[PDB]
Enzyme design. Structure first.
Site, PDB file in Angstrom:
ATOM      1  N   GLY C  67      21.584 -10.881  51.607  1.00 28.87           N
ATOM      2  CA  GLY C  67      21.912  -9.742  50.771  1.00 28.87           C
ATOM      3  C   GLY C  67      22.103 -10.153  49.326  1.00 28.87           C
ATOM      4  N   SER C  96      20.534 -16.766  53.967  1.00 33.39           N
ATOM      5  CA  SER C  96      21.035 -17.443  52.772  1.00 33.39           C
ATOM      6  C   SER C  96      22.489 -17.113  52.444  1.00 33.39           C
ATOM      7  CB  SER C  96      20.138 -17.078  51.588  1.00 33.39           C
ATOM      8  OG  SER C  96      20.194 -15.691  51.314  1.00 33.39           O
ATOM      9  N   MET C  97      22.803 -15.829  52.254  1.00 33.85           N
ATOM     10  CA  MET C  97      24.187 -15.470  51.961  1.00 33.85           C
ATOM     11  C   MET C  97      25.047 -15.533  53.214  1.00 33.85           C
ATOM     12  SD  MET C  97      26.804 -14.808  50.350  1.00 33.85           S
ATOM     13  CE  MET C  97      25.914 -15.197  48.854  1.00 33.85           C
ATOM     14  N   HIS C 121      18.095 -20.891  51.799  1.00 33.27           N
ATOM     15  CA  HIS C 121      17.067 -20.989  50.775  1.00 33.27           C
ATOM     16  C   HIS C 121      17.698 -20.684  49.426  1.00 33.27           C
ATOM     17  CE1 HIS C 121      16.779 -16.634  50.274  1.00 33.27           C
ATOM     18  NE2 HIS C 121      16.694 -16.517  51.587  1.00 33.27           N
ATOM     19  N   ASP C 170      12.541 -22.280  52.449  1.00 34.22           N
ATOM     20  CA  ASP C 170      13.197 -21.808  53.661  1.00 34.22           C
ATOM     21  C   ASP C 170      13.332 -22.939  54.672  1.00 34.22           C
ATOM     22  OD1 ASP C 170      12.956 -19.505  52.247  1.00 34.22           O
ATOM     23  OD2 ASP C 170      11.942 -18.354  53.815  1.00 34.22           O
TER      24      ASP C 170
END
Lengths: 192, 56, 192, 192, 192, 192, 192, 192, 192, 192
Positions: C67, C96-97, C121, C170
């Site tokens: 997000g 990621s988050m 990432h 990634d």
């Protein structure tokens, strides 16, 4: 609209929802496409029931055409974690993810209705971008295929090689045929 | 009626009381049981104090 | 849609939704894409819980495909600010988050289910306009990338150089692989 | 879904909303784009808290990405009008209007989290039609620019020339940098 | 989401929404575009407050950018009809209808925050059809302009000729400038 | 958002809606375009009011730009059927359908605000299909046109010829002009 | 918004919606287009009302532009099946299904307002596909037309041939003309 | 929109929905297109009723144009699985799936209104993809066709050959004709 | 792309499009929808051919699914105005404009192919606006219906009543049937 | 882009479109959907060839997926009307209209390629409107179905009953199957 139902208790009578009323009976419904929002709802229901009675079984009616794999693993890992046995019932349809959650139930408690269709296929995906990114994502989805096939082989009891050849393409199975593969243990034709 | 016969009062297959069946209330009441009184509201203790029951 | 449950109490019993019932047990759900609206809702839940008991732990279940970075940092700061330790559990997916918030939990309280995928990432963004404006925005995102890597290395324990090379593209990690890196501390497979 | 919480008081137990529960603790949330609808809600909340006890400071969290300048000045004028001191806390992001309301808090009661970001830029606008109308709107927005800069210089303490120069283009400021510029007074890292 | 507040009374505590709570204090909010639906809502509130206490003043906040003229002539006629004086406070923005409804307040009970903006222009319209119909619609819109121009001159104190020369094109007025024309009386900056 | 009001009586406190509260006072609101759903709602209110007190007058506030002819006639027939007199008050605007229902009120109990606007015109329509079908609909709408004019003349007291000539095209009548035409009896300016 | 109403009873005061309150008085509203969902709601109301008193008449207010024949027939069959007589009142408009359901009421209890319009025509439909399928659907709709005309002739009293010719195209009828045709028995002009 | 009703008993008054009130009487409504969401709701209603009293019949009112096969078969297997007998009543329309669920009711309890239409045809489907994939889906739908026909012949009592020819194309059947084929057992025209 | 055909001329060779070459033989093609732009082109061809030879007949092929009524009248009037006889031949089928133009050919020069269908229906149209305008357009198109029928009766030698009765709805006529109706003279079998 | 093929004629080397060149050799190409515009062009080409030589065979190619039924009848009738015998050949595939125009050629000169497919089925249509209009269009298309079966049976030589059974649903016939079915004469595998 969801109909309301009144429950009679010593304290009095309160109006419950049709789905909430059945939750007291340890009944959970898995309907529609699998997603994060609905997956967490099912996860919370399982945890709540486990606290109420960690020994009583939980009944899960699966009528779904499939969905996101990650959202399904959130449910599979929860079932194998909680102490009570989760009884899986195939209602109407059980696709790739639905069938995975159907055979992940406790042994001897994976039921199916006579007029029900079960389908198992290969994971679907895709990516757009650089070649380096494509191979990175391609190798990730491949691991899921083998990882999922290994789990399905454990519950069904079939060899990994057999699962790979069967899940290569869409394989439709009926209630009697599903019992032979090991996805389900018995067929529910009529209560008692 | 919901305990001794079909529990459907509304619908195409229910039984609406419009045939001037004055006997219905009498025959139904004759089948009264303590549980029926509990659903009516009467506390279990009061029912126990009244053993004899006579319907009219 | 959302089921309702009851909590038997000495005085009587009250009805609650499935999500709010678990909140009473110090359980917060982080589902779906991260944004300001849901992030502030999680912030309020964390603050409310520490007021009731600033010593008990708080459980945060994470299942989300990433997000907004700014919205996520609001949660990270809130977790590091409050006195009670926040336990993070990954269910299904961690992007990621989501992975940054997963590894940001207290030491020895970062768990993950066996069949879970974790992706990390570098941040992605963009800006259209004059060259001068593009330069200003480019420096901001670059600083964010560095700061995020520095914080990840702190919780995971890996070197900054390793994080930079690993997060350049990634990188998918499973539950066992996540333990080696330091994102999590243990894996939950069965109760007890 | 917004969770519901229960507050135990002398008079009994009351079930409030997570956002409404924090309102009793002199806490107001400023999330999302700034518009007339949300601005009036914040104005009403401030006035209500003032009537209860106009001696306790009010807390206003700011995780907004900006918005209209008309609705933002309504909140600013209300903050400086009411007797109690409005303590602003930057959580996650503070844009042009979000940063104008952050620095417009009581002196010594302006805080920002360590990973929060602050951005300040000149007003945006535009108009289509006759050249005569453009002249009217062009001079009006310029007055707002000069007026906003004047207020920015007052709270921050920086010279009007520095504010005008830094506001020509988008300027990003981290929590430590914002302390030197005068936007905020302290940084909240850990409780106590 | 509108927060819910509690009010302590002799009979007991009652929960009301923030807007409803302020309604008890004779406070009406005028936000957003003016239309028939919101206009009738304001008319109902004014009539309800008059019956409760026809001698206590009524406060009407104006944070609207303008709207339909007919919707705004009902509110105006309702304010001039009821006995209690209707105070008007400009909050942020006041366009043609908002400014017309800001100067229509009781003489001596009109206010404009320090950083509020007031804009006055002439009525806008348009019709597509036969030339005969265009003339009918053209004459009517010209009567509304003269009618509204005369009402403003009565409430502001300026000559009709000046109003015609100042409303031909958009005229933006700050709070200090509005006091000199007559749209408002004083400016509220602090409690005392 | 409709605000909630309180009604104090010696039966217990009851929270009512602003519109529902006024219904108890024999006040019905007619807002927006006239259609079948809102028309049936107004009809239900009228039948309910006469049950409480079939002698007291029923007030109908009209602020609408017109609507379907069939929907309006449903209200007209209901007004002239019920025993109590229906008092019509025009606030804002009253178009073809709104004006017909305005002048249809009880003689001597039709009011209009000073700045209200009234408009009257012939009915609109159209049909696409075979020529034979067009003649059927062409004659039907003509009958309605004559029927509406006859009823308009009856209430206004004018001649059928004058109504036809005046309603040939749009005719705008102010409050003072409507009194001369006969659509209303008096004008309400201040509460005397 | 649907207004609320209070009903004083022995137990106290009960709150009801305007529509639900009228349902208690054996009044059903048939508004809008006739569809499956709306028809089932009317059926449930008829069956529900029958249980309380099978000897009390039921009032069905009809104002609709028409609808599907299948849904309408469900209501028609229910009206004839239930013991209590169904009184049909036409307000506004009555189309093919509205008129059919209007004349299907109990003989002598079919009313109509003076300014109501009644329209009757043949069924509409179509099908796209093979010629063999078109023949099947063509014969199906033809039987429906004959079955509908037979019922219309029964209630109205006109001959089958007259009904056929008069329904070849749209036929508009007023309240007096409807009485002559036999679609209704009386006209309600004024109370008593 | 949906009317509310009250059930007066010795205990007191309870507010119930029109659909919920009928649920207490073991009445389920099958309205609209068949799908997983509505089918799951119907299944929940059946299971809940079974828990209350497994010896009382359940009434299912069918009015639908058909839908998904999988969703429909879930209801079929649920009707035969539960101990209570399920009575089916056709109101207005019964399509391919609706007719299959109509004849699937308990013998001697399948009713149909006189003015009702029943349609039966072979299932529909399709698939786009590789040739080998088309063969799998093409072969699967054929099994459903034969499987469904075998059930229709069992409940109706006809032969498989007759069903195959009749279901080759759309076959419309009236209430009297349905009795001959065996889809229903009796026709309900008037009470008693 | 029309195929070019090289016919030797005085120079020796000249390529001409298939249509241009057939134009020399007094052959005009009528294809696609009929509109003003297409109609003038045909009129130009007929006028040009008349100049070439005012005695020789002009062959006209009519194969189009109707079109604008006014566009056809121009072609019809031109045919009777010019001296050469225009033979009309229908290929494939004949629509409203096609059939009107087909029978407009000179007596003894109207033929048709063995497999062709002729359809005749009344004019179609529609209008949206005021009732007064509808009557004007309704009467205008009504005259066209009578005017077109009169011309058709004259050429087909049929009573005006038969044309009106048969033109109320679409009437399909085969090639042999058209001969008996007077639209054409005889069918076109194999040459010689 | 069409290639320019050169032909040294009497005039000299002069290029023409590849299709125009083949027109001189009495070769017509039928490609894509069949409509009035394309069908009309084909009629012009065939008639032109007949003028040059009414006793020279034409080599027609049919590669189309079907199209308008009426547009094709014009070509069929035209082919039999002209004295030259048209040799019909199928390239790639033959559809509903393509197959009808294939067997229409003179017996003994109808060939097909080794790898080609022919499909035949009943006509496809549809109409939306009143029941009377539907019956008219239903009978029209019904007659066309029988008309084509007669013509196709005559050329194919198969019995009317046998072909009628096969035309109910799509029937695919390969090159050898067409020969046995009597639709073609032989197969062209290699030149000479």
């Amino acid at each position: 609209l969801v109909p309301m139902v009144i429950e009679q208790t010593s304290r009095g009578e309160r109006s419950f929802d049709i789905y909430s009323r059945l939750l007291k009976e340890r009944v959970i419904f898995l309907t529609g496409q699998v997603e994060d929002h609905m997956a967490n709802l099912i996860v919370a229901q399982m945890l709540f029931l486990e606290a109420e009675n960690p020994e009583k079984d939980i009944y899960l009616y699966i009528n779904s055409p499939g969905g996101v794999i990650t959202a399904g693993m959130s449910i599979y890992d929860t079932m194998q974690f909680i102490k009570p046995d989760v009884s899986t019932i195939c209602m109407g349809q059980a696709a790739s993810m639905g069938a995975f959650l159907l055979t992940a139930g406790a042994k001897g408690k994976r039921f199916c209705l006579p007029n029900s269709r079960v389908m198992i296929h290969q994971p679907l995906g895709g990516y757009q971008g650089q070649a380096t990114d494509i191979e990175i994502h391609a190798r990730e989805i491949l691991k899921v295929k083998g990882r999922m096939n290994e789990l399905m082989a454990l519950h069904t009891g079939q060899s990994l090689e057999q699962i790979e050849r069967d899940t290569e393409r869409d394989r439709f199975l009926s209630a009697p045929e599903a019992v032979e593969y090991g996805l389900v243990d018995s067929i529910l034709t009529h209560r008692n | 009626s919901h305990r001794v016969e079909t529990g459907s009062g509304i619908g195409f297959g229910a039984t609406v009381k419009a045939k001037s069946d004055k006997a219905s209330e009498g025959e139904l009441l004759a089948q009264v049981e303590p549980e029926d009184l509990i659903k009516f509201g009467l506390i279990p203790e009061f029912i126990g104090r009244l053993p004899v029951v006579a319907t009219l």
